[PDB]
RNA sequence: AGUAAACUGAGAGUAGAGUGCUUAGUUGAACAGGGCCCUGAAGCGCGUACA
């Protein structure tokens, strides 16, 4: 537990120790995203406290280091199963929110590229395909996330919806949000539209841009989606997998393109596939590299009593020998400090 | 002198598909194709058709050679299963015992 | 006491049931008669009589203590090495004992013995295990390491662990199927 | 059995190990010898020596395990539990310090109570002299009958869609609170006893 | 084709083509027009790099070829 | 009791042909205590009766 609650002063000497983030935070910030178990947890508990670890802190630096004059550097956060990977990512922005940056998070890309019931084509493009329902609710988190800088950033073109209906340059991006939201149809589009619109004008310097992807390796791999003819589908296909893989480029400049690899939910990937290249794959390591790459693995034996005793105060381990260093010795041996393991014995214990 | 007219006529049919398997086997690989006409291919059905009916292959059964039995023999032995049972609990048949695992 | 088959072959004679009786009971009542010294070797020429083997601790090149042993389950095979000093490391087949077994019983049977003599973190291990399936694997891999660690824990201790059933090879493997029934107890559907 | 006669079956208890030897009477002291020289039976893998073992939550498992899938029968009864926990936290946040004495929050001893407020201290028999019989019920046949009932009143199609745990976890907290189907039929099982009554004499 | 070749070849490489962008961008950035591709590859880090990249590309991937790898990028990237 | 149950392979035979048969392996439990009207097996025996 940190006296401090600023994400942009707290540093290693916080190291080993929870870090609340504020029920209204959580809401804006963090309308999607969070692992469901850790979501399940915060609602048993009204606490969002994740404990800060050098890799948190190592990204947080790297943010504060980066020059937007570069153009956006790519990290990549790599590991096993269960690692943190996604709470590492969720505290670093939570920090850039709290330093007004545009956060552009993707809250996993495996869900994008597989159980699509509502996939139609392009109208802007007839050879590619879209994802209605997942644009809307991308759509929708991003609005959440960041209302304020929606009115605040206007267009720099015209897009046409219908052959009579369209928006006109210098139109704020809550009119391109509003129509992608409300009119399903249009979600993609409007969410190319937004990707295109907030490269171009974080390269004009409009803002600070954290382009924040979970489980980057789905994008170039492979597709369980079926066209109509029951022909599998290539990631390029799907105008979202497509447009994110522009933004992933670091062409662009005012910001930076963090990304947090993911091998839960991924497709014809072996369980144990978790390094950087066997996940990404060719297509991936070419598309990413030049990247960052930044590992996190198991609780060391500080960040375990930290979260054994967060679990004690929290009466979570609601056992009788859940305290006693016996138990947390077992604890110790079946998770071996993966935090993952760790709480899904934890819940029943 | 053979057991019984089915095993005789057993036996002329092996003669007669072994005699024409050779012209049997060339009709039938120029009528499974697709490359040569369909009246070519027609010709050969008709020349195979005409071929004897006991040339078949197809009507050759692995009767018993002991005992002509239509049924129940094994490939390996060539002898239905009561004479195969009789040799082995004989003794008759080199390193076949009984069964116990 | 010598059962009757024993006896009559000792006898070389053909007895009877009650024969045996009257020669046990007569034996019976020497022993109780204060039998001495004379009378006991006597004696024991009718008596019948009614531990586990602590294996060498080896040592690797770099001096470290270690002892080796092996184990099969139904048709898994392993054979652990266990050192004498370890962070309760088990490094099974190259792999983490977690990620190989990524069922908690399994996980549960490899702590089984360690659990048992308190020695978990004391010992790290490395397991190779071959055949089967994975619940025989697991067994197999139980029994290598309880029988490895018998080296390292007291004769008590390996007492204990025998009684329990660590150390006592499972005999109970699948019964083959017999022909004319499904299984190799079940009977066909009984006809009418 | 493969087992020979001669095998017995391992004792699994730490403490019944660690008593000392003075404690122990002569019976006892005997007991330890003699067990020395039996054959013992490879352990079963089910039960360990763990602190957290609970043989009845074990059996209720065993029970509701269709086919041999032990590892969905577990998930489940963990699942039940975590979720009557859940509820027992939020019902103690939603209540007064007063009621907050009163309100339970251990899932096994939630568990426990509503088995024992489930159990059916009469059970009828068939009886011949056939007539249906009040007839008293052993433990062991008690603890089975409150088992089986809360897992066919779980799985009667009744409930729509509705998951085992959640299902689960209702149920056993209406039982706890001596209500629901399975305290129901505990008490038909009881008035069938009492109108039978007159035929006990058979 | 490169589908065509068991062994990765760090020349005509993507991740040679990508590495000597970021030093162009970096230098760029610092405004500093002294740079060349044949200055940038002579230097001993791109050598280690190089090395580094080869050795994951071809040889088993393990943690000691990744902190290769890792303290590579760093040093390149000037981040410490 | 590695039994039931479930699952997956292989073999026999043919040119081909089974949800049939044979066989290998995997996961793998529950009851085991009451009684004899019903079936059958006995002893205690009873009473029938013809060869
Ligand atoms: N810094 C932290 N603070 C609090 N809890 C944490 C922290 N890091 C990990 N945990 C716990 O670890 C659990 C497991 O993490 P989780 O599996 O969601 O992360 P991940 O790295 O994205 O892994 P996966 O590959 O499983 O998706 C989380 O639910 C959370 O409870
Ligand atoms: N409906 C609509 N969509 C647009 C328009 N302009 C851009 N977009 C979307 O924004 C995304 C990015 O556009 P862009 O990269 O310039 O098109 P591309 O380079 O040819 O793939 C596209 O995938 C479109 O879906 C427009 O005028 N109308
Ligand atoms: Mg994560």
Known sequence: RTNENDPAKHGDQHEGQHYNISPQDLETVFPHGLP???????????????????PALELLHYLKNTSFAYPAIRYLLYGEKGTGKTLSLCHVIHFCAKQDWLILHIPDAHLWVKNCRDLLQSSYNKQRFDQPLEASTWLKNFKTTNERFLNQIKVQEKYVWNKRESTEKGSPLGEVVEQGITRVRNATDAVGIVLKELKRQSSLGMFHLLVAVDGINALWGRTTLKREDKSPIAPEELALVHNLRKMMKNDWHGGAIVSALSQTGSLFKPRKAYLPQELLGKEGFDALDPFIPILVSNYNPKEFESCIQYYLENNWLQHEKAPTEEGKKELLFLSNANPSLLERHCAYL | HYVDWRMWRDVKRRKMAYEYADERLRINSLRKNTILPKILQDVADEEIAALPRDSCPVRIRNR?????????????????????????????????????? | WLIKEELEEMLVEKLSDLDYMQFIRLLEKLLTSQCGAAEEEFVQRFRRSVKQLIEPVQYDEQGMAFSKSEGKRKTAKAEAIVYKHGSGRIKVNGIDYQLYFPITQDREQLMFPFHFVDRLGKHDVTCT????????????????????????????????????????????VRERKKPGQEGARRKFTWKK | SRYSPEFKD?????????????????????????????????????????????????????????????????????????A??????????????????????????????????????????????FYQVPVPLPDRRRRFLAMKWMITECRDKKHQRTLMPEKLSHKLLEAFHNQGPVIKRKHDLHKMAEANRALAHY | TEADMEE??????????????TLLQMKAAEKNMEINKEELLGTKEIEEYKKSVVSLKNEEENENSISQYKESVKRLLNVT
């Open chain 4, 10 to 82: 391992p004792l699994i208890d730490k403490e019944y190990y660690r008593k000392p030897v003075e404690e122990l009477t002569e019976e006892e002291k005997y007991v330890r010898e003699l067990k020395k020289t039996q054959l013992i039976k490879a352990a079963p893998a089910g039960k360990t020596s763990s602190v957290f073992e609970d043989p009845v939550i074990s059996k209720f498992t065993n029970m509701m395990m269709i086919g041999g899938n032990k590892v969905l029968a577990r998930s489940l009864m963990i699942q039940t539990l975590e």
């Open chain 4, 84 to 129: 009557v926990k859940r509820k027992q936290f939020e019902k103690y946040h939603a209540a007064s310090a007063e009621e907050q004495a009163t309100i339970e929050r251990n899932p096994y001893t939630i568990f426990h109570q509503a088995l024992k407020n489930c159990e059916p201290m009469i059970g009828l028999v068939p009886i011949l002299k």
């Open chain 3, 129 to 172: 295990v071959s055949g089967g399936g994975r619940s025989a694997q697991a067994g197999a891999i139980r029994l290598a390491m309880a029988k490895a660690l018998c080296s390292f824990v007291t004769e008590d201790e390996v007492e204990w662990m025998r009684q329990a059933g660590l150390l006592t090879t499972d005999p109970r």
């Open chain 2, 64 to 101: 018993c050679v002991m005992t002509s039995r239509p049924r129940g023999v094994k490939r390996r032995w060539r002898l239905s299963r009561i004479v195969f049972r009789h040799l082995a609990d004989h003794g008759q048949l080199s390193g076949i015992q009984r069964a116990t695992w």
């Open chain 5, 8 to 21: 990765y070849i760090w020349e005509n490489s993507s991740s040679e083509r990508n590495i000597l962008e």
């Open chain 1, 36 to 54: 469901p178990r850790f979501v399940m947890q915060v609602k048993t508990f009204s606490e969002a406290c994740l404990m800060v670890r050098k």
